[PDB]
Design a protein around this ligand. Structure first.
Ligand code: PC1
Ligand code: 3PE
Ligand code: 3PE
Ligand code: T2Q
Lengths: 98, 172, 70, 114, 51, 318, 345, 80, 115, 96, 105
């Protein structure tokens, strides 16, 4: 249990590190976000099964629901970005410097 | 045995690391599928199956859509892999080595409440009801319909609104 | 004519029958002339472990009746 | 800080049943009406005290009553009960709906002789 | 206030609409033949695709 | 003993895939006024072995534009899953009794698509990519209705286990109460396999071979046998869920026999359909599954949610 | 945009923070935050221009990261002490990462680099929402756990927000970024006092809201987005210069205007806890905040920049705006200090 | 309107059936006399142990034995 | 353990087949053979360029529908509950809201492909 | 037909569960007695070991309450072998 | 809490399943149920400032039931000493600790 939770926390931290340290592509950052969601879902399910608290299992499924909605709107924004610039690069949305 | 769940968690960690290194979203979705498979395995190893199969199906659909999208928006002439860039491969190997170091030095200097290589496999399923009939995980997730009705309307409205919202965003 | 097709159909039918009969006969041969006990809930698994223990050899299908209560 | 007391290996010794599960499932519906008193005393004593150490002699009495039940069986109606639980051990789940012709012989036997 | 960094900076548009470099179409070109069964054997049919 | 059971479940499935290719060819021939293989062996019972041996004797291709890792992984995974979907099947006794067997099936099937996706992407050819995107569309189309059909059926079974359907159908098929759901499930299994009229992933008339166009003898054989195995698998699923073989605990052999008869019928029907119809356009598949099957599927899901209640016919939990 | 879509989206925006406020469980606070940031985006990108798309991206990514961090905090506080809502017996690391993520969302410094841009790229009625209605739910969270927040971190964050807001809005020509930096500074104030007294951060929030909403209304009257544009008000809507000047001087924190009340009653409650230095610096830099409001007053009302030959047309025509709420709020945002005892407690 | 329903039943019968089944699913529970029995059955199942109570001597309505004629009978479910 | 056994057996079967397919036959490799296939002629470009997607909205919608399926799947258990009216009502509301979202998409022409 | 069959199945479930009810007391007694036996064995051996280490109390609890805290798998099956331990964890998840 | 609407209308949307000691499906019980119950009952009516000092014993018993750091330390020390003994040949596990046991019942 403790080693499992330590490793899942380290994994969340790695995915957060990826999300913070951008590269050219945006979808990679969206995927890192989904990986954080995965880590958290797994941690919550493991905790609820270790505690035998079957009243908290409805929580991780909601986590997944909202994470996937976030992913959907992210993909839509990605579509718009590609339509505008032809690519999902981040170095192109730098005109709001004024 | 006894090293089973730890190996699962380590594979999940490596998958998430190779994901965070941000190769072409193709291999990133691959790593995410693998990490979801490992998460399913570990959730099953802790007692619950419904949640594991669920998350697996969900992320499979998601990575299907993500493949469809990256082949249209997030592609390149020469897509990058973990091996393509010497620097990325080096930091990947470095991360594996650093995980090894952290584990082997915490076992030594730290207490056993985090990582106990000696004593592994002893703390997975602390307590259980040996005479039990109604312990499946789906009972909790079905509580949504009877007891936790609030989470259900919340999620359903999230999805409704999401439909309307994605339509409005994609309007040209 | 159309009856020149029955050879392949019969071959594939035999090949599709073999798995189930094999599984059943093997389960009987390995679980003491009985159907492999199903553990859908923890109660059945508890029963099976009880049987395993009380049986002189650790095997759940060695049923011990009234010969073992006096 | 404080010590935790535990009975001694002899304080918790009984005449165990050592009888399988299909047999218990066969005899349960009759073992419920004939040992309800002691079974329920033990189990109430269990939920009320929440300690498996305070409620032990009741469990020994439970074992004794079960042994007496199965002896009343083994004396009068060993063979019908044998047929019943042998038929009932075959299923992968030990179902009753597969051994109804033997259940009736067992129940008639007991209705008559006990 | 001007700096060596904010020299190239241009005042934004009055309607938040930016004259943008017209990114030309990239239409996938495909040799539908020959050797393609639909193509009756000697047709090449170079065509452009958006999807 | 368990390894011997693995063999008795695996090698017959592959022999059946081979002779299914045979029966496919011969049935389509006789429908097309021709014979089909009769030369290689007596009535052609050696053509599959000839094909397979010849393929595994050919030079495979390691192109210059391909991602060899995925190019090689994809067929491995295809075949692996095609063979793994057969383990939890009760005939009438399964090799692996899973409570959530239906979900195992669903997930493994939804995973078998990534073989096609990664193959078509790795190959790095335009027709391969087209086949991959068509597979994406096909899955996005059918996967929504699959699970809801299956849930609506299971709401009278009481669980996701494949062995409670046997006691559920102990008296009467599940086709009578669910023949609409059975029809939709039949067509959706027809799509899950990339089988006509939904042979769009390898549509020879638009895409020379789709995701196979760069693949060669051995890996191609793996793909092909995975397809022709999943065919039998989905037929077995239809005939365990909606059609019910006779289960008498003292006679599982009759159960296996009738299961096989019905599976043969459904597979021959797949071949019949390949022979009888043209091919869809992969947008029309989406329109179908999202405008005729999904609305009706939701209506029937609600109907079968209510039916156990205003009938007091809620199933049991074990 | 059709009325059904508008209904769903605005109802969702409204509902989001309500769930957060009215909920005991942290997970439902999280889903409320998510409703908010999922429904607000289409209202940003509605105009469908590159600036709107990139504003939407910069907003979505930031808020999603912050939400994932808050979710990690909740999940750790669940793994520990087996409950959902926080308690006195909870790890300070958890509490402080939660505070950091809530700041990230709110847009406090040094987590502010995204708010000026996201506000410059979108229309004004959304900047209003963004800066007023979307800063509540986070503040609700912070007000339910104020006894547990570290004072060092919030105070560093607050002085940083003050300094950066001042220095940033000091050299801005676009008005939307000026309002963004004003939000940053006033949120620094709101947060500097939260652990000591959260009944005062709510006061400062109410006042900042009733102050910025009519400013945004003024800007929306002539769709004014620059200093040079508002310089033309003396020819287009000279009846607005008085209220504009008063609201600006109040935002800056000048007596006898009720924008000085938050500053004053926060400095007081801070020195009741011996925070002399923090309050001192905060005030001395709120002065700098006032400076550019004063330069703007110059540009708009206290002198008359050149106009154009075409504004004569706008003079010819009539106008239906503003509504009744502008005058109400602009009066209750400058001429209500005499009622301070009623406002403070 | 009948002509509209008719031309829809001819052209787009799938949506007609969908709405009809939707309405019937929503209605029939309000109609049947066997609806009350669902919860009664799901309540009759002893998924847990029937923890007994202490005989304070003031429980006349409560039985001393399973086969004591007192408590809820399941005849309504034995002949249904 | 048996599931692991069977699945690994299948892995090994597939890998053996691939090994004996890559090492048994005689090979003769050269560039004109290993080059991509575009119907007899040379590709005009790489297949790694943006291949526009015309059903992106339908895929996004498929995500949310998959989640609604995930929420519908616990019914086999939710029907074993005493509070049956609540389960009935919630399931009906869920399916109805799902259908209404689908209908709005349909009408606003989301299920139709960009051309 | 499905209505009728599912009703009879519910009745059969009642029957099976009533049998389980009739048997649960015996199983509870046996389980409690067996857990106490295992714990006493582990106590005797913890006393043999830890005999000379300084400042060690054999049966000392990690709790300040004196009520019975039901032990957990690690304790019950800690001194025993590794197979007897893995069975308690993965025995039922890794089916019969 | 910030807007106690529930406590006003007298409903429960999110508060009946917060902690482990709440009503679970089919009257099961999450582990550490009694410890959590006692902690909550001690912390009732006095505030979180007092509870951090007066329900400290109970909260610590809860923390130990749930996380079990001390049982872990204890069993680890026992195994370590036993390994030392076996290493230097001063111990032999009894039969019931080496598989060979009397498997009651
Ligand atoms: C889980 C995902 C693993 C995340 C950590 C990355 C570990 C592998 C990194 C090593 C580099 C692999 C790579 O990217 O090479 C590109 C290659 C693409 O081909 P290629 O570009 O290397 O082609 C090279 C040609 N030769 C062989 C002649 C030199 O893809 C891979 O090898 C990795 C694919 C990922 C598969 C991961 C599942 C492995 C299954 C077990 C076997
Ligand atoms: C923290 C301190 C970072 C040290 C400075 C290194 C700068 C850096 O490499 O980060 C940027 C990098 C993306 O760099 P990129 O846009 O791809 O340009 C080519 C890089 N020479 O970003 C990345 O490479 C993403 C890194 C995320 C994964 C980190 C996990 C490392 C494992 C340990
Ligand atoms: C390596 C690269 C290639 C990877 C591809 C391998 C093929 C993948 C096949 C798809 C599998 C996806 C679904 C996840 C596995 C299925 C989980 C499952 O069915 O349950 C696990 C089973 C117990 O399940 P259950 O019956 O519900 O519990 C009560 C039992 N009395 O018992 C178990 O707990 C066993 C769990 C192990 C699951 C098998 C995974 C093997 C992985 C090999 C690699
Ligand atoms: C005008 S039409 O309507 O008539 C039109 C209808 C379709 N049609 C048709 C149908 C089925 C098969 C084929 C021949 N064919 C075979 C293979 C292929 N087969 C095996 C294989 C592996 C292991 C096997 O078992 C064992 F070896 F034992 F392991 C057995 C086989 N690998 O690859 C691949 C491609 C291919 O075209 C042709 C005829 C023509």
């Amino acid at each position: 249990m403790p080693s499992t939770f330590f490793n899942l926390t380290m994994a969340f931290s790695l995915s957060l590190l990826g999300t913070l340290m951008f590269r050219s592509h945006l979808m990679s950052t969206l995927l890192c976000l989904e990986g954080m969601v995965l880590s958290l879902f797994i941690m919550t399910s493991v905790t609820s099964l270790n505690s035998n608290s079957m009243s908290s299992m409805p929580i991780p499924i909601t986590i997944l629901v909202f994470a996937a909605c976030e992913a959907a709107v992210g993909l839509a924004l990605l579509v718009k970005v590609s339509n505008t610039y032809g690519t999902d690069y981040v170095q192109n949305l730098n005109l709001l410097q004024c | 045995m006894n090293n089973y769940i730890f190996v699962l968690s380590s594979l999940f960690l490596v998958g998430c690391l190779g994901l965070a290194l941000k190769p072409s979203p193709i291999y990133g979705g691959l790593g995410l599928i693998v990490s979801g498979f490992v998460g399913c395995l570990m959730v099953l190893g802790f007692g619950g199956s419904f949640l594991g199969l669920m998350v697996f199906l969900i992320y499979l659909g998601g990575m299907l859509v993500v493949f469809g999208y990256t082949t249209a928006m997030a592609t390149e002439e020469y897509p990058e892999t973990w091996g393509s860039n010497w620097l990325i491969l080096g930091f990947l190997v470095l991360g594996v080595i650093m995980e090894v170091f952290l584990i082997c030095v915490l076992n030594y200097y730290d207490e056993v409440g985090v990582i106990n290589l000696d004593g592994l496999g002893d703390w997975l399923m602390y307590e259980v009801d040996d005479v039990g009939v109604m312990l499946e995980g789906g009972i909790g997730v079905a509580a949504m319909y009877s007891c936790a009705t609030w989470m259900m309307v919340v999620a359903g409205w999230s999805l409704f609104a999401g439909i309307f919202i994605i339509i409005e965003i994609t309007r040209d | 004519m159309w009856f020149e097709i029955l050879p392949g159909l019969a071959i594939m039918g035999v090949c599709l029958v073999i798995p189930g009969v094999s599984t059943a006969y093997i389960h009987k041969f390995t679980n003491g002339g009985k159907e492999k006990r199903v553990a859908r809930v923890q109660y059945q698994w508890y029963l099976m472990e009880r049987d395993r223990r009380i049986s002189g050899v650790n095997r759940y299908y060695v049923s011990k009746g009234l010969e073992n209560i006096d | 800080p404080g010590i935790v007391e535990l009975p001694t290996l002899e304080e918790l010794k009984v005449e165990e049943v050592k009888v399988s599960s299909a047999v218990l499932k066969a005899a349960a519906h009759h073992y419920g009406a004939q040992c309800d008193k002691t079974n329920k005393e033990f189990m109430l004593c269990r939920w009320e005290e929440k300690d498996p150490r305070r409620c032990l002699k009741e469990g020994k009495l439970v074992n004794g009553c079960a042994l007496n039940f199965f002896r009343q069986i083994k004396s009068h109606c060993a063979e019908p009960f044998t047929e019943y639980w042998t038929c009932l051990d075959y299923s992968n789940m030990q179902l009753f709906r597969h051994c109804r012709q033997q259940q009736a012989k067992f129940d008639q036997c007991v209705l008559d002789k006990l | 206030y001007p700096s060596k960094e904010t020299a190239h900076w241009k005042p934004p548009p009055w309607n938040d609409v930016d004259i943008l470099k017209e990114k030309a179409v990239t239409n996938m070109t495909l040799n539908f033949g020959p050797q393609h069964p639909a193509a009756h054997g000697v047709l090449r049919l170079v065509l452009e695709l958006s999807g | 003993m368990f390894f011997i059971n693995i063999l008795t479940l695996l090698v017959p499935i592959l022999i059946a895939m081979a002779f299914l290719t045979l029966v496919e060819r011969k049935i389509l021939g006789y429908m097309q006024l021709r014979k089909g293989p009769n030369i290689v062996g007596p009535y052609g019972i050696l053509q599959p072995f000839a094909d397979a041996m010849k393929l595994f004797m050919k030079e495979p291709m390691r192109p210059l534009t391909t991602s060899m890792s995925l190019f090689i992984i994809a067929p491995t995974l295809s075949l692996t899953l095609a063979l793994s979907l057969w383990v939890p099947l009760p005939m009438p006794h399964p090799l692996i009794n899973l409570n959530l067997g239906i979900l195992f099936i669903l997930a493994t099937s939804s995973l078998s698509v990534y073989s096609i996706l990664w193959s078509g992407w790795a190959s790095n050819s335009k027709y391969s990519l087209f086949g991959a995107l068509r597979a994406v569309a096909q899955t996005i189309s059918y996967e929504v209705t699959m699970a809801i059909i299956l849930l609506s059926v299971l709401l009278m079974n009481g669980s996701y286990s494949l062995q409670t359907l046997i006691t559920t159908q102990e008296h009467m098929w599940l086709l009578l109460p669910a023949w609409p759901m059975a029809m939709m499930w039949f067509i959706s299994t027809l799509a899950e396999t990339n089988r006509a009229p939904f042979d769009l992933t390898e549509g020879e008339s638009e895409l020379v071979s789709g995701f196979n166009v760069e693949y060669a003898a051995g890996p191609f054989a793996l793909f092909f046998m995975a397809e022709y195995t999943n065919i039998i698998l989905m037929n077995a699923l239809t005939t365990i869920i909606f059609l019910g073989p006779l289960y008498y605990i003292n006679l599982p052999e009759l159960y296996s026999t009738n299961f096989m008869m019905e599976a043969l019928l459904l597979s021959s029907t797949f071949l019949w359909i390949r022979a009888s119809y043209p091919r869809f356009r992969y947008d029309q598949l989406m329109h179908l599954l999202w405008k005729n099957f999904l609305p009706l599927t939701l209506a029937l899901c609600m109907w079968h949610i209510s039916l156990p209640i205003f009938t007091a016919g809620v199933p049991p939990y074990m | 945009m059709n009325p059904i879509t508008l209904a769903i989206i605005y109802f969702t925006i409204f509902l989001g923070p309500v769930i957060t406020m009215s909920s005991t469980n942290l997970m439902l606070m999280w889903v409320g935050l998510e409703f908010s940031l999922l429904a607000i985006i289409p209202m940003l990108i509605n105009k469908k221009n590159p600036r709107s798309t990139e504003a939407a991206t910069k907003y979505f990514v930031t808020q999603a990261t912050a939400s994932m961090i808050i979710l990690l905090a909740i999940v750790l506080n669940y793994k520990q002490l087996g409950t959902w809502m926080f308690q006195q017996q909870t790890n300070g690391l958890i509490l402080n990462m939660t505070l950091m993520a809530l700041s990230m969302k709110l847009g406090l410094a040094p987590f502010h680099f995204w708010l000026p841009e996201v506000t410059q790229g979108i229309p004004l009625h959304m900047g209003l929402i963004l800066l007023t209605w979307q800063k509540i739910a986070p503040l609700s969270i912070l007000i339910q756990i104020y006894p547990l927040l570290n004072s060092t971190i919030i105070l560093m964050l607050a002085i940083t927000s003050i300094f950066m807001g001042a220095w940033g809005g000091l050299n801005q020509t676009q008005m939307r970024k000026i309002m963004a930096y004003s939000s940053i500074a006033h949120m620094g104030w709101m947060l500097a006092i939260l652990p000591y007294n959260p009944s005062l951060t709510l006061l400062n929030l109410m006042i900042y809201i009733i102050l910025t909403a009519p400013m945004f209304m003024a800007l929306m009257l002539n769709n004014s987005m620059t200093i040079n544009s508002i310089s033309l008000l003396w020819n287009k809507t000279p009846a607005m210069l008085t209220m504009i000047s008063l609201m600006l001087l109040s935002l800056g924190g000048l007596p006898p205007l009720t924008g000085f009340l938050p500053k004053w009653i926060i400095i007081t409650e801070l020195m009741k806890n011996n925070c002399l230095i923090m309050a001192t610096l905060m005030a001395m830099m709120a002065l700098l905040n006032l400076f550019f409001y004063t330069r703007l007053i110059y540009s708009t009302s206290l002198t008359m920049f050149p106009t154009n030959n075409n504004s004569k047309m706008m003079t010819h025509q009539t106008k239906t705006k503003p509504n009744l709420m502008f005058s109400t709020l602009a009066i209750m945002s400058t001429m209500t200090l005499p009622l301070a005892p009623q406002l403070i407690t | 309107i009948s002509a509209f329903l008719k031309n829809a039943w001819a052209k787009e019968p799938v949506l007609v059936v969908s709405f009809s089944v939707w309405g019937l699913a929503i209605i029939m529970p309000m109609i049947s006399p066997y609806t009350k029995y669902a919860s009664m059955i799901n309540k009759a199942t002893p998924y847990n142990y029937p923890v007994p109570v202490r005989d304070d001597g003031n429980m006349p309505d409560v039985p001393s034995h399973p086969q004591d004629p007192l408590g809820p009978s399941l005849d309504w479910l034995k002949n249904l | 353990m048996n599931l692991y056994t069977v699945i690994f057996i299948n892995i090994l079967l597939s890998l053996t087949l691939i090994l004996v397919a890559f090492w048994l036959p005689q090979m003769n490799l050269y560039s004109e053979k290993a080059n991509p296939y575009e119907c007899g002629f040379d590709p005009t470009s790489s297949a790694r360029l943006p291949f526009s997607m015309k059903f992106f909205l339908v895929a996004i919608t498929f995500l949310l529908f998959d989640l609604e399926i995930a929420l519908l799947l616990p019914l086999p258990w939710a029907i074993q509950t005493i509070k049956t009216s609540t389960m009935m009502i919630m399931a009906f509301i869920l399916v109805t809201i799902l259908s209404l979202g689908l209908a709005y998409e349909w009408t606003q022409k989301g299920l139709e492909w960009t051309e | 037909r499905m209505m009728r069959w599912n009703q009879e199945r519910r009745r059969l479930l009642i029957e099976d569960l009533e049998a389980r009810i009739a048997l649960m007391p015996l199983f509870q007694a046996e389980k409690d007695r067996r857990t106490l036996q295992i714990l006493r064995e582990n106590l005797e051996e913890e006393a043999i070991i830890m005999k000379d280490v300084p400042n060690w109390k054999v049966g000392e609890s990690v709790f300040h309450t004196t009520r019975w805290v039901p032990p957990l798998i690690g304790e019950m099956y800690g001194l025993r072998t590794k197979e007897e331990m893995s069975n308690a964890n993965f025995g039922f998840t890794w089916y019969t | 809490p910030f807007l106690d609407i529930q406590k006003k209308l007298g409903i429960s949307l999110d508060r009946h399943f917060m902690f482990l000691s709440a009503e679970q499906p089919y009257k099961n019980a999450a582990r550490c149920h009694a410890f959590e119950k006692e902690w909550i009952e001690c912390a009732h009516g006095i505030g979180g400032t007092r509870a951090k000092k007066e329900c400290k014993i109970e909260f610590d018993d809860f923390e130990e039931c749930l996380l079990r750091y001390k049982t872990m330390r204890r069993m680890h020390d026992i195994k370590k000493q036993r390994e030392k003994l076996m290493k230097e040949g001063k111990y032999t596990p009894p039969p019931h600790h080496s598989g060979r046991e009397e498997p009651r019942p």
